[PDB]
Amino acid sequence: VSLLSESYNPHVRYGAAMALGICCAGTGNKEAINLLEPMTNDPVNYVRQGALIASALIMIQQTEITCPKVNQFRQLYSKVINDKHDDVMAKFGAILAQGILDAGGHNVTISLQSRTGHTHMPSVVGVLVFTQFWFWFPLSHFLSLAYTPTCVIGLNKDL
Amino acid sequence: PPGGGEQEPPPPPAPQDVEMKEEAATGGGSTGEADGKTAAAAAEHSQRELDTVTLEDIKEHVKQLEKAVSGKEPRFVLRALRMLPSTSRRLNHYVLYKAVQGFFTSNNATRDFLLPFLEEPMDTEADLQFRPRTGKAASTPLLPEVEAYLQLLVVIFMMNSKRYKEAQKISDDLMQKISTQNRRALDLVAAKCYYYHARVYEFLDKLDVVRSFLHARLRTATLRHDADGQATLLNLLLRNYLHYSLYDQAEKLVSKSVFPEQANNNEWARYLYYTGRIKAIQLEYSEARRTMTNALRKAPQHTAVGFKQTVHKLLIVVELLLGEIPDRLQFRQPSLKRSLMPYFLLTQAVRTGNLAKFNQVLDQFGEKFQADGTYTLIIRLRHNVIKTGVRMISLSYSRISLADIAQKLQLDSPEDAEFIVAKAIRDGVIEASINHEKGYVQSKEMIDIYSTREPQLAFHQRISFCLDIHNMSVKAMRFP
C-alpha cells in the first residue's frame, strides 16, 4: 500500500492510511509509521485526520521507548487542536487520537487476533463500523468493543 | 654489469605493488560481495575479474622465472588462515614478505615445488568459505603458466591442476546448491579453465573422456543450477566437435532450449559462428547468412586479434554461394588483407562469369584452402559460377543462340547448353521461353508485379525491427 498512499486523490490516500492503521495496530512496525509521516503533511484536510487516527492505532500501549515518533506525534495532536487557523475537521481526530492512545487509562488495547488463532468478532465488528464516523456520530461508540484488556491474572481457582 | 645490475631492481616492485593490491581489492572486495548481494550475481567484481585476468595476460602474467617475483605463486596460496578474524594477521604476513624481498634476495620456487604449494590450501585447513577465491588464487599462477609451453613434466602438473580443480569442483557441487552464488562466479572460471583444458589437450591428445566429464557437467547444470555456465559448455562441445567428425550437426537441435539468456554478449554470437559453419554444411544459406552477419555486427570492439578477422573470412563464404555478394574490401584491415590475398583473388574470379578463371584459382591457391578445411565450398560453388554467367547473359541479351553461347562460357558442347537452362527454369533463374528447332533461345522482360510483393516482404522486417528498437529503448529508459 506504500504506492497507493501516494495516489493523486486524497480519498484513496485516506483509505490507504486506514489500512495501515487497522492492520498494523497490533504490531509495532516502524515502516507503517514511516509511510504515515508525510500523510499529515498533505494540504488536503481530512487525509491529515486519517493520519492522526492511524498513527493513534499504531501507538496503543507503546511508549516512547518503543518507537521514537511517539512524543513527535503527541505534540502534533495538541498543536493542531490549539491553532485556530487549522480546519475543525482535522482537529476533531486530534483529540480523538489522544483518546485512542489513552484508552482505558493506557491499560487496554485492541486485538483483532487472539493468541488462540481466531479473530475476535466484537473487536472487528466495532472497528469496521467505526470506519465512517462522519455519517453517524453515535457509530464512534462501537470502537469501545474493540478495546481488550491486557493483564496478568494470577487467580488460582474459584474466588 | 653495473648498468644491467642497477636496472634489475626497479621492475619487480611494479607488479609487487599492483598485482599485490589487485586480487586483494578485487578478490577481497568480492569476498564481501559474496557474503551478500549476491544480486544477481553482481558480483560486479566478476566482470572486474575478466578485466584482471586479461590484465595480467598482457603484462605481466605471473612468471617466468625472472628470479624476483616468482615467489608470489606460493605466497598467495599460503595462509588462508583460517577464519576471517584470523585472516588479518595473514594479510599482514603478505606485507612482511615485502621487507624480506627488499632486504635479502627473493626466493624462487616453481615446477616440482608447486606440488606441495597447490596442496597448501588443503594443508592450511582451510580457507574455508570461498572455493572461488581458492580457485582464483590457485589458477591465477596456473592460467598464464600455460604460456610457458615447455611441454616437459609441468604439463602433468597442469593435469594435477585439473585434479586439484576437480577437488574444488566436488566442493563446488556438494556445498551450497541453494542460492549458490559461488557457482555463478565459478562458471566464468569453469569456462576459462575448461577452455584451458582443451588448450592443453590440443598440445598432447584430444580428450575423449574429458568430454564424458564435460557432458556430465553439461547435462547436470540443467535444471538444478545453470547461469551463464551451460552457454559456455555448449561452445566447449561445439569447438572440438566442429573439428572432429561427426553427427554433432543435429546435436544442437536436441540441446536447445536456445540457450537464453544469451551470454556473455559476444560470447553468444561466436556460438552463432560455430553453428554458422555447421548449418552451412546443410547448404542452407538463408539461415547461414544471418547467423554469419550477426556474428560480426554483435562483436565489438577488438583488438585482439585475428579470430575476429577469421570469422569474417568465413562470413562471406555463404554469401558467395548465394550468388549475391558485396565487395569485401570495405571490411579490409591491414592485418587481414595480407592474410586473405589468395582468398581475395578467389572471390575476384568467382564473381566473374569465366569458368576457367575460377578453375585456375583452385589449382594455384588450393594449398591455403587445405589448412582452412574450406574445400567443402569449392565443389558446390561451381553451380553458382555457371548460374551467375547465365544470369548475366539472360538479362543482357534479348535472344541468344545456344550453340554460340557455349564458346564464351567454355561450355564445350551443345548438349549441356540445354541442361543449364533446363535447371535454370526449374529453379526460377530465368523466365525466358526456349524453342528447340535449330535451336534458339529467346528471352522476355516482365515487370509491374515487382514492387507489389518485394517491398511489403521487406517492410515486414523493417517495421518489426523498428518497433524492436522502440522496445529496447524503452527497456533501458525505464531503469531510472
Added chain:
Amino acid sequence: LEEGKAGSGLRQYYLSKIEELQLIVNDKSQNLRRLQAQRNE
C-alpha cells in the same frame, strides 16, 4: 538422507528459482513503478 538433504536441494531450489524469476518480475515491477510515480507527478 537422500530424500532429503540432497533432495531438499531441488526442493529449496524451487525457492531460489522462484526468487530469481521473481527478481526478474520485481525488476519489471520496479522499472514499471517508476512509471506510476512519474504519471502521478
Added chain:
Amino acid sequence: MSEKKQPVDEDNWDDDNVEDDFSNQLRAELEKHGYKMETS
C-alpha cells in the same frame, strides 16, 4: 575484450567494385583501344 575465443587465433569502395571489374577485364585501356583501329 580480449576474453574467450579471440586469443585462440561515399565511399571509394562502391566504385572500387567496378574498378575490380576493370582490373580483371579489358585492362584500362589505351593501347588495345588504339591497336583495334588498324586491325580492320
